Amino acid sequence: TGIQISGKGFMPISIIEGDQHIKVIAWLPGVNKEDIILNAVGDTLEIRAKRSPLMITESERIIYSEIPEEEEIYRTIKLPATVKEENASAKFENGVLSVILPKAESSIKKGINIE
Amino acid sequence: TGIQISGKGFMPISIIEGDQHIKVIAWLPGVNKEDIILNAVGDTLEIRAKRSPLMITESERIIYSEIPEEEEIYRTIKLPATVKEENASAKFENGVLSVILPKAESSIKKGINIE
Amino acid sequence: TGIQISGKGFMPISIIEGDQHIKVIAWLPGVNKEDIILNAVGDTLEIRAKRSPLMITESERIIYSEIPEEEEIYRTIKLPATVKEENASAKFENGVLSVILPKAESSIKKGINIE
Amino acid sequence: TGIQISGKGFMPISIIEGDQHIKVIAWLPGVNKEDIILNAVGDTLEIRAKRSPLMITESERIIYSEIPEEEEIYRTIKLPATVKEENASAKFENGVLSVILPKAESSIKKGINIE
Amino acid sequence: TGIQISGKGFMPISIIEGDQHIKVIAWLPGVNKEDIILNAVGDTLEIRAKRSPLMITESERIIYSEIPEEEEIYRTIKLPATVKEENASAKFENGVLSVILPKAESSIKKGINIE
Amino acid sequence: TGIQISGKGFMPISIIEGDQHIKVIAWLPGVNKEDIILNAVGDTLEIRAKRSPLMITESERIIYSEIPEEEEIYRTIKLPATVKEENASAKFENGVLSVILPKAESSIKKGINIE
Amino acid sequence: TGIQISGKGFMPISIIEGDQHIKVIAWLPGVNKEDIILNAVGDTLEIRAKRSPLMITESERIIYSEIPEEEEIYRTIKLPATVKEENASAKFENGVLSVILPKAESSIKKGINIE
Amino acid sequence: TGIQISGKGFMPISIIEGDQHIKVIAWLPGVNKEDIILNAVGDTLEIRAKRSPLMITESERIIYSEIPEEEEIYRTIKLPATVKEENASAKFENGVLSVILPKAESSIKKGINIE
Amino acid sequence: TGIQISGKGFMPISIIEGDQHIKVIAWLPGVNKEDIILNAVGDTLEIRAKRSPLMITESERIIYSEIPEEEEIYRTIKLPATVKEENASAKFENGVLSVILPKAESSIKKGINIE
């Protein structure tokens, strides 16, 4: 399986391969649904997102923090099969994005008989 | 500011202190609202959560993954002020939890005049 | 959870916290029941014990040993809650001591509603 | 004295040799008497045991622990003398096991006169 | 020759290239014939297998072992030529699997004359 | 348990001890049944085998290999009990050899009563 | 994004990807416009240039220098998309070269709807 | 320029790229012309050769040597352009082999005008 | 055997000593026969050669190279015997030079009888 991942930001990724489709799971906590861009062609997928920073009053101040302040995040993924992007689907729930991509006919493997 | 953090799992935390309240922000992507337990007394707050693992069919398999598989997560936080837990509030949205805690009368600071 | 452990000897310890009580488990192999002293006040517990050494005849001698020969052992434990020591209980069986300590009213945490 | 020790788990051991017998002392805190298996032949002794794990309610949780969670423990010991296993005896008290093994006639040493 | 190997488990591999075919040899000791899955398309081959673990009675126990206990094993191989999977063959004997894959017409090399 | 292993080649081994017998499991992928020699006496077992090397045509060549080319393999094993070799049995299946060896009367251990 | 850069000399490069085109910026200080060669096909671009060395009189001499004296410079770039070279354009100004390359129809990505 | 070299033996290589062809130069001292195999397809070239070892009489012996004794040598080369192998040519002289390979129409680059 | 080698360039050497002659083998790939100078006197041999560099057109360029560009090469060899240079011979074939040198009468060794 040839996998290429590139981009910037904090975004953990899981890839699941079946016999006839591919599933991608991405973690995007704090991002609105209307600020995500998803694109795909051939064997390549592209995810882009923005998250708004934490807004404080001037009376308030941050005394402890582990949450990063990158505003723009993106990933480019090269997949081990050619997909059909016209039949794909996606869902966003509790800050998790799930993409389902059906495989093309020329990438579906065939069985060999053992004796 | 005396801050104590302990627990287990993956859970980034931000603490914001104002003049009359304290705000806590926690990242919990993939957790249902009905699986969170929030408790507070004195100057101590406790957050407990469960996230369901990723369910696959036996035809499918995971070829790449960066998402951790801990099932139980919790944090215990000791705060720099005594709060009133009977007036507190919380919100859960896009996988982010936000807690607002009002301060007690014996922890509100008073000004000194400079000349 | 603020935990402080100090003392001397060999004595493994487990601490279990519930919603309304605290349980402590201690390993004391070879100690008689009438040679244990247990005390508690506030948020502090104290365990003291003696074990008799191995008595041999002058015809006999020790050719191999991994068992330590400390005679006095004790632990002092500072707990994350204030307990009521007048309602506590303890049991000793197969060399294991188990202590149950009920929590005070000012240390019982209260729930916050999420919406 | 040729001594061989092997096995798995946590089990400290002491060996005492006299003129006509051998004594073995083992530390087994938390084990029931009916879950110990003792065997011996020739110059070899075998001890097997099980200890039940710590059972909690789902309201409770373990915040500190030094007690190990191995469930099966055993030791195999090769001794410096041939014993008679038909005359041996054993005792279990406060989590300590004590085994007494009489020596065979062909392993009892004889004195040489000095002048 | 571009060769890509990925997967999990213990499975040694040999690849042999001729003028008109490719041969793959894999070591699978302890696997039943009906628990192997072989697939191929384009220039990629996929081998999946399961081996049952070693079953003991509770009187018996394992005192020495060098054999690994992974239950699921697989390999994905990217080959230096495009093959025809409809003419391929495979054999399984003494725990060794042998796969023969004929080459496509567009991957058969042609000679150049030297003078 | 006194275990001695020596020899040459690639041959993983598992040893299982019961109350009245000993089992040995060996991995020999690629070896014919008629090329194995098994011997035993006292507390010692001996396994010898040959595997034929991989035969190629001069048009073919090996471009990748992880399979070793030792031709002669053997193991000598010293066991923790004296066996009866006249009652032993062996099986060879899918490249795995399994040997069952009954114990002699002078190596069967006897129980000691605990009180 | 698969990017391959090779060549020789001093030539800093920037690559900008849009939705429908690719832009390349190169730094070539001291090079005449009529000494640049630009070529492209498929997903590959090639830049070649010459710069004349610094000409001095024999009365003059160089007492300090940080400017390199390579005479031939070139870069070969492999791009993450297939372009149409018949619609490309280029500009040279103040020693900076800018190339605009339109994308082919088979490399333009398509959107997936999220719900 | 994507270049891949693999193989075994001693064989220095030079690659020259023009506008419409590719030239490869290889050093093979001591090899007969009738013991060289040259093949090419797509963007890949393959060179195979044998050299006879140095034959001595039993009266003679080698007291100093820097010449290696590998008998089989080969190289596989992946080129940065697709060639036409039906129009290629080769020459062998003084132990040097020279191969000329014409480029295909889809790999010939086109010029871009600068203004 | 006293052997001295000196010179410059790339030139591997083998020396073979018999009972009545000495043979020298040298690797010179790419050198014309009319550009070699061979000299010998006493116990010293001298080899000098030139190789023409690789000539390219200005459209062409070298993108990969392992072949060295030294133009002048020579070796001086001091031998373990005095030779007769008036009876020597040499051959040049496939880029390999072979020199045969007969030994003088004062360097031919004589046998000693063993009893």
Add this chain to the structure above:
Amino acid sequence: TGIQISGKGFMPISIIEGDQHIKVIAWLPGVNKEDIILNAVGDTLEIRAKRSPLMITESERIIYSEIPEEEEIYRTIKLPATVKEENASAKFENGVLSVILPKAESSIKKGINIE
């Protein structure tokens, strides 16, 4: 010769093997004759001793010392032959102990003729 030495204290040892007996020499300076215990069976010998410490008056004090103050000393020795302990003898003189042990009939070696 299989030799095993174990014990505690300061006691240098020499072992001398003849054709029909074994001699052991031990250094015990400062030990009374009536405080030594010597035992032997099979192929094992055991030496035990006590030495009284240095007694001072309270006016006196030790300003320099290299003599050790261990009070109990012992050695256990496993020999390379089976002896007859009923025919052994021992002597003590100037702080040196000498033990003579005759060999059993089954440990006396026999000669092989060379031709």
Add this chain to the structure above:
Amino acid sequence: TGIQISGKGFMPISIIEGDQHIKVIAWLPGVNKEDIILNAVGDTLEIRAKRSPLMITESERIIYSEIPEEEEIYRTIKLPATVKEENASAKFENGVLSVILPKAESSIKKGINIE
């Protein structure tokens, strides 16, 4: 195979095990036949030898030497089988000693049938 080697001097050793005998080969250059002592019992063999030192005249002196000057040499070998020393044989030729030792009936291994 349990092998124990001990002794002093320079004496290389080879051990060969068959089905019914054991062979030992020892290198003793410079030793007379009448100065070798060979003994064996049980599973133990003993070789003792003396070699005379190099005798020079006072006019002569040693300007270079690699030959050691130990005068007494011996080896003790513990074998992996019990032998019959009354049927053994030995030969001495060109400074090499060869010993043949037949095996006892209780050390000859028996075959196990595989199915």
Add this chain to the structure above:
Amino acid sequence: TGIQISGKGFMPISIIEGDQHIKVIAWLPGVNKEDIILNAVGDTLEIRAKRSPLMITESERIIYSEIPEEEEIYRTIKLPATVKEENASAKFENGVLSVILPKAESSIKKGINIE
């Protein structure tokens, strides 16, 4: 206390100082009484001794040894007080030598009163 010790061999020493005398204890195991030389003058003492080496028969040999083979031993001791050597005494028993040396009048210390 100024103490100087010098000499050669193995000889442990203890020095005891009182109010009116000095005691020296030396360990000499294996030395005859008639082979000791004791001398003293001023503040210096001298001990010289010989021990006979271990005498073996040519049938016997030493297979293990920790006892040193120095034949001559001596110590020179410079003391922190001037003694009277005409009133000194010495004893030899079980390999231990004890010397008593009375102090001179000019080295006896006098008390100072504290108030």
Add this chain to the structure above:
Amino acid sequence: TGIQISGKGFMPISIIEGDQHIKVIAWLPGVNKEDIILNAVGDTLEIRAKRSPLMITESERIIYSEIPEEEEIYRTIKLPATVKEENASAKFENGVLSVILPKAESSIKKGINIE
């Protein structure tokens, strides 16, 4: 004394120089007398030998070995004097070769008178 040693194999050497001759001693255990070649001229000596390898039956196998398996051995020695090879002699006994070489008249040193 100028000494040069070269060659291959295992062969220890001693060189002894007198007033009128030179002696060489070589260790060759396991070599037949008819397989040695000795030559000398000027100030150079040459020793060549072969030893047959250890021949086993297929029932037998080598379980331990320290004896090397080089088949061809030789040494070349350059001496500090010119010898007369027509008066030399050699002996072979118990695997040791001894060569005596008389000196030439031009290498015999002459005395200088001291006053």
Add this chain to the structure above:
Amino acid sequence: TGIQISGKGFMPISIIEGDQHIKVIAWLPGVNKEDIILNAVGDTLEIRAKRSPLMITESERIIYSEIPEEEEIYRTIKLPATVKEENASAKFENGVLSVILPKAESSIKKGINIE
């Protein structure tokens, strides 16, 4: 070419070998012509020189210096050919000495024909 250089001082050297002569170049700045000694015999050359030190007045002093103050300098050179010293010549100019040495007839090399 056997070259030996020895001596003391600062004197850089160049050696040039032709077909019939040898040239030596030496750097001697600050040396008068009448203070050089040149000698040669066989294959050895010897150069000796003196340079006067820098003379100052007592008003003057040296505040910086890199020029060395050795007064005597010499070199001894062993050459790779025997020369005729009766036909040699030398020149001294601008502090550089040049020596030309013709070769003897027995060191002039002769050509070997190649075919």
Add this chain to the structure above:
Amino acid sequence: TGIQISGKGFMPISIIEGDQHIKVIAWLPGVNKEDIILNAVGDTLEIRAKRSPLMITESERIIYSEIPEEEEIYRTIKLPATVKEENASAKFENGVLSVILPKAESSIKKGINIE
């Protein structure tokens, strides 16, 4: 004394300061007098030179060399006093250049009286 030296090549320098002048000595072996340029102004001096390289015939070659082949050499020196360049002088002899520079009136130091 402020001294600054810069430039390139091999040129050792000595600087001598008096009461009324400055002397500079430079080593230039192999340089012609008509190829030196000397300049001075203020407190700065500049020396420039060329040396011709060593010219050989094509029959000749350089087998050893320590003389450097830089062709252009120069030094710039900043002096600790202001000089009058219109009264300066220079000499060149045996490859050594000597420059005398008179001091200006404003750099001549004046004495202070001590009492």
Add this chain to the structure above:
Amino acid sequence: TGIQISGKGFMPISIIEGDQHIKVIAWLPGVNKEDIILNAVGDTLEIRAKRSPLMITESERIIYSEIPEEEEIYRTIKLPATVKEENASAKFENGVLSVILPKAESSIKKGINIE
């Protein structure tokens, strides 16, 4: 100057070369004149000596020593010229030996004229 020194012992050496002779100085303190052997031939010199060891009475002993106890000492020296040993001379005084060796006619160097 080719100098070779070899031998054993303590013997410092100085070598002085003139135009027509060679001088050697050696330090031999404690050696009698009648125990020195001096030899020379060609270009080689040989010095041999004995010194008697230090003789003590049994009442006396050595408490400090820096003088070495080698009894035999020798040096072999290879000189840079051929000498005439029939005209040599030697002197011995205060433990210093001085040897004068005249040079042969073929080693006397001849002058070359410089212009």
Add this chain to the structure above:
Amino acid sequence: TGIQISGKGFMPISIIEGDQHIKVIAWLPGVNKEDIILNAVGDTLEIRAKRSPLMITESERIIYSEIPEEEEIYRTIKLPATVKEENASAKFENGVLSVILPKAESSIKKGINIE
């Protein structure tokens, strides 16, 4: 024994102590008898010497040297006993000086009786 050595130069020293005298041996090669100064008082000895340096002619020069060129040498020695310098004696022979010093009455040691 308190020994103090100080001074400068090369001078090895040996000190021998008897019952009634002290002997000192010093190595002074190359020193005349009339250039030595010997002094002693109390427990201290002083040796002073001069050696003339090696005198050469200006035709001669030193090409190798290990002999040091210190001109003044001396040693001061503090002894472990008070001597009588009016009864001392000294000898000088072959470059070795020997001094005999009788002991005073207050340093002669007295014996102590052992029982």
